[PDB]
């Protein structure tokens, strides 16, 4: 729900104002997923990681 107006002067050069309560009600919520991995391998000599 956008309103096109000048307000508070914290929106001068393409910055924009966001309503706090909408953010508290789930507006713009997001999830970030990241992955890590490891390998255990057997060497030529009969020895291995553990």
């Amino acid at each position: 729900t956008v309103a096109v107006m000048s307000y508070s002067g914290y929106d001068i050069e393409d910055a924009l104002v966001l309503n706090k309560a909408s953010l508290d009600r789930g507006f713009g919520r997001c999830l970030v997923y990241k992955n890590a991995k490891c390998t255990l391998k057997r060497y030529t000599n009969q020895t291995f990681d553990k």
Binding site: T1, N19, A21, S22, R25, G26, F27
Partner: protein, 66 residues
């Protein structure tokens, strides 16, 4: 994924409207008549149900089950 509980803009409870909305649509209503029947007046609230995509139904088909 799943219907949000409260309308973002004004804080009205819309989380309990999804099943009723689908039922009224199933009765050959139109979206306007269904939304007015449920009592959602402010257009900041009608978009909460008119523009929802129910991904949980499709996601659960890939979920593990016995």
């Amino acid at each position: 994924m799943i219907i949000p509980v409260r309308c973002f803009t004004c804080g009205k409870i819309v989380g309990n409207k999804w099943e009723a909305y689908l039922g009224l649509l199933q009765a050959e209503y139109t979206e306007g008549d269904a939304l007015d029947a449920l009592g959602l007046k402010r257009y900041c609230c009608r978009r909460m149900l008119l523009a929802h995509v129910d991904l949980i139904e499709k996601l659960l088909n890939y979920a593990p089950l016995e």
